[PDB]
Design a protein around this ligand. Sequence first.
Ligand code: MG
Ligand code: MG
Ligand code: MG
Ligand code: MG
Ligand code: MG
Ligand code: MG
Ligand code: MG
Ligand code: MG
Ligand code: MG
Ligand code: MG
Ligand code: MG
Ligand code: MG
Ligand code: MG
Ligand code: MG
Ligand code: MG
Ligand code: MG
Ligand code: MG
Ligand code: MG
Ligand code: MG
Ligand code: MG
Ligand code: MG
Ligand code: MG
Ligand code: MG
Ligand code: ZN
Ligand code: ZN
Lengths: 201, 127, 25, 214, 97, 97, 91
Amino acid sequence: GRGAPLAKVVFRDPYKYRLREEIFIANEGVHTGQFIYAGKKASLNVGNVLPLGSVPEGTIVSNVEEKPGDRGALARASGNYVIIIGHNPDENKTRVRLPSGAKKVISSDARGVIGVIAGGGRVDKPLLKAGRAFHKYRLKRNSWPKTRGVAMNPVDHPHGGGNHQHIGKASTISRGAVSGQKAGLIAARRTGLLRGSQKTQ
Amino acid sequence: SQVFGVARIYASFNDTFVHVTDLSGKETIARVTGGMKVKADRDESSPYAAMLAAQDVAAKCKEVGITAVHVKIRATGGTRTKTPGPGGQAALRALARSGLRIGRIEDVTPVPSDSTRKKGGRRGRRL
Amino acid sequence: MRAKWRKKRTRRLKRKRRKVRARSK
Amino acid sequence: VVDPFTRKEWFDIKAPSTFENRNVGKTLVNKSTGLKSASDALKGRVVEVCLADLQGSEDHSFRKIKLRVDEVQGKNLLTNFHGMDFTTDKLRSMVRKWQTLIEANVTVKTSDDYVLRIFAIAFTRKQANQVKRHSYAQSSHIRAIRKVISEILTKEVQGSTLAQLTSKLIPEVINKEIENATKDIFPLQNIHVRKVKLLKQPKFDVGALMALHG
Amino acid sequence: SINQKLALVIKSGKYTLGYKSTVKSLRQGKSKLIIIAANTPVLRKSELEYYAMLSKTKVYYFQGGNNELGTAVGKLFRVGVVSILEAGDSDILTTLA
Amino acid sequence: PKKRASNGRNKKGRGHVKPVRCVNCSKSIPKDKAIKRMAIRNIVEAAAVRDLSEASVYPEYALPKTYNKLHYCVSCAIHARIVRVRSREDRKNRAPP
Amino acid sequence: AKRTKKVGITGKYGVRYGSSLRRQVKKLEIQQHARYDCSFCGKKTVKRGAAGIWTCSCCKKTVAGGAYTVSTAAAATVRSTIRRLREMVEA
RNA sequence: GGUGAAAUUCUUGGAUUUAUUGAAGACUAACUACUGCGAAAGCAUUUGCCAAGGACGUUUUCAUUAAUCAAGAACGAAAGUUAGGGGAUCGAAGAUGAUCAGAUACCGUCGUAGUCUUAACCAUAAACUAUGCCGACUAGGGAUCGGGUGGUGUUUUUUUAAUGACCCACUCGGCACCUUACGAGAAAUCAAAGUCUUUGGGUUCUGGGGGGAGUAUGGUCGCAAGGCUGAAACUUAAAGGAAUUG
Ligand SMILES: [Mg+2]
Ligand SMILES: [Mg+2]
Ligand SMILES: [Mg+2]
Ligand SMILES: [Mg+2]
Ligand SMILES: [Mg+2]
Ligand SMILES: [Mg+2]
Ligand SMILES: [Mg+2]
Ligand SMILES: [Mg+2]
Ligand SMILES: [Mg+2]
Ligand SMILES: [Mg+2]
Ligand SMILES: [Mg+2]
Ligand SMILES: [Mg+2]
Ligand SMILES: [Mg+2]
Ligand SMILES: [Mg+2]
Ligand SMILES: [Mg+2]
Ligand SMILES: [Mg+2]
Ligand SMILES: [Mg+2]
Ligand SMILES: [Mg+2]
Ligand SMILES: [Mg+2]
Ligand SMILES: [Mg+2]
Ligand SMILES: [Mg+2]
Ligand SMILES: [Mg+2]
Ligand SMILES: [Mg+2]
Ligand SMILES: [Zn+2]
Ligand SMILES: [Zn+2]
């Protein structure tokens, strides 16, 4: 139920004689046998893990931390990555752009892994039949298929009932709504078909 | 003898700028435009106004400190009409005659290695 | 009429007959 | 009821070494207050005086010079090198029809690791007796001259800093060596270094700066 | 070129192709050059290199892959190493390489 | 019929030359058919030259022109600038003044 | 002896789902089943097995890849971009 | 700000202007020309790489291997279509400001698709020189582009050369211009559109009064838009071309 493959990477325990194996999301191009380096003072190659402070701008990294140590939070879905778009060294913040478009700033100590996450392209190919979605959500969570609330009776849902199917009122629901009410377009600040280049500036 | 500011006279059509700055540029001093010293829109570039504005500007230049100044006259340009406007002439004219000093003046009309498609489309602004 | 606006006249004209015939294939 | 004229702290601009008048100009600031000070915020601006105005002689009216403010010490702010340009009028005059143009450039690092790009311009010339009304080099000609200009420009930079390069460009020696190696290929006229830009400086280092001063 | 050189060697000299049989050649100190394909794994690379230094034999690090090495010696298969046994008229042994 | 050997204007061994934009209406028009004119004129003007040198520093200074190539579109070239319209013979004549 | 005219592998779906989708699947499907050149051992023996996973028959290395193709447009451009940036920090 | 003049529009959010950096994508100004190259579309920053090519030189090689071509095929501006990416600019659509009797426009603002690129399509332009290709012959001139041969030419100085650039005569092969008329033509004009009632070097292709109409129909190609092939009935005395006078 994950898009991108994992990568099992074993390390020596600096303190005990033993191998300690970690689980990574595999960046594209990484491979069995490959040597992976992790540390401030380490080298800028696909597969390694370096603190956003130590890589030049335009570096491309995956599985990055929001706070240093949290062992990776941003950009883990197949195909996603982040780009360092600036640094402010007196404060050691570093500024990234996340897959969404949003640009956060985080500790230059927050770590990331050089590259992009693998199995990208996954969503370009049609699911084609209900069975393929079926097995898709089967290994995720019981969220499929989805009855339209407008096919329900009133007991069931804001949209239920009436002698033809129809929402009956604006399906744009305030943030200040209350559970039992938030179905539809929640807190929608605009609505309708999007025309013209999206792309945040 | 003097103290050296920078003139920078932007003379496009429908308006003329004059405003002196510190030789470095970061710090300005005084401005005023043709649209400032007459009222009728149509007459916002014309010399007789570019005078009356280059007049006010000559004042402040001395009513603060700057004795002298080299000019860098400029037109619209970019992907546009590269020619000096009507009232940059009147400016230069009526600012050497005012009471300041001139010396070493060039043109900073932006002229690209050409590109960025001109406005008006293939058939031009036709009428 | 301009030659080409007439070329465009009968382009349309054909699309319509092209349609109306399909109606009955 | 203010008029920022009653307030603006004032200042005078000095130039650096290899020139005529180190005294250059004056400037406006804004009183050095605790928090937001006349100091650190600006100063480091840059000024564009013609080096003829900066070297006396007038065989120099073109060739623009950019002086950036690097340091400051009470009513005295020194300036150093930041680049050179050309007067737009001189340029649009060397470029006459009926003759082949040639331009050439290279990015490069001096000693004091200031990195920069210098440009070169040159045009063909007719020679005294040339009947044909235009004179054009022959492309294979152009690549040659360009190459050499590049071999000659790369040498001169990475002599000790712009400091010597500054010293180098002002007498425009580079121009003649160009013409020197060149006339083995094809005539030519004008031949200048035209433009030079600055794009990478090393660390501040109050030392080397305060060696062009005293 | 270098291929051009190698070309000469093929159509006039003596050689051998492949990992086992250039070691026969290194052990018998019969090799004059061994040429090493880019993507040949380091272990093999490192091993030949050791073999070669013990036998005082220079080693060319052919910067193409073993697919194209095989084509450089004009075979429709692929070689990870070549051993020059004699350079027929080719100067590879005493040119740049 | 055909009313010019140059057809529009002056391309005989090509096929295509890039267009340029009219310095007036911004109309596109091939660079060869284009109608051009160097606009070299001082930075000053008529009487401004006298009240220049006076209030300037330096002796005499220099005086520079502006230099900007002008491209019209025929219609614009005709409507105002160089054009008149020439007789059937006076047409042929390409000598400028 | 040309068996189909344009469905190809996509003939398994017969008439269903609409040409336009059958088309798009057929693309990524071809991608997704092909034998690829192995960077490492030079034989063409890389086949898929679950999205992102590209492992070499003989020779036995596995590589993270795209979901239906070994190397992804971006993956590659990223590769070169890092390489560029890497080399910027030792010169 | 924008204009013939305005207005819609932007302005405590310091607009416009200035100044120091930075980003993105387009484009290649000036030099650019009666100048180059390509089968045609078309091609203008540097550098490396990659294979290609005409002209020229040639006391080299082969020896009729060639000319031109239904079918068939390669490329094919712009827009347009499919799937990514890109999306600075300009900007079909649309919405607006104005003008107007009206104004679905022209002018002004916003600006979707587009514009760029990859992988596939489409196959059309006044895709023009409105002018098939190969061969022969017929007439004057000065320029120029590329190659070449000649010269006790000019300039570069060093010590004189070597060179390089320039000069002059010739020669092939280019893009073109000029003057002619042997000649041609309905003329305009044309060194081919000439060497034709004194009508034959070879070869391909198209037209046969105007509309109807590139319409209908079939076939075929295309995702589509559309491409190619392509009639009739019926109507009609003209339509048309060059030149002249008004
Ligand atoms: Mg369920
Ligand atoms: Mg449902
Ligand atoms: Mg649903
Ligand atoms: Mg029900
Ligand atoms: Mg309810
Ligand atoms: Mg409700
Ligand atoms: Mg309901
Ligand atoms: Mg409904
Ligand atoms: Mg008009
Ligand atoms: Mg029906
Ligand atoms: Mg007529
Ligand atoms: Mg007419
Ligand atoms: Mg054409
Ligand atoms: Mg250019
Ligand atoms: Mg047939
Ligand atoms: Mg756009
Ligand atoms: Mg409209
Ligand atoms: Mg209206
Ligand atoms: Mg409309
Ligand atoms: Mg056609
Ligand atoms: Mg034409
Ligand atoms: Mg002749
Ligand atoms: Mg009919
Ligand atoms: Zn025009
Ligand atoms: Zn393998």
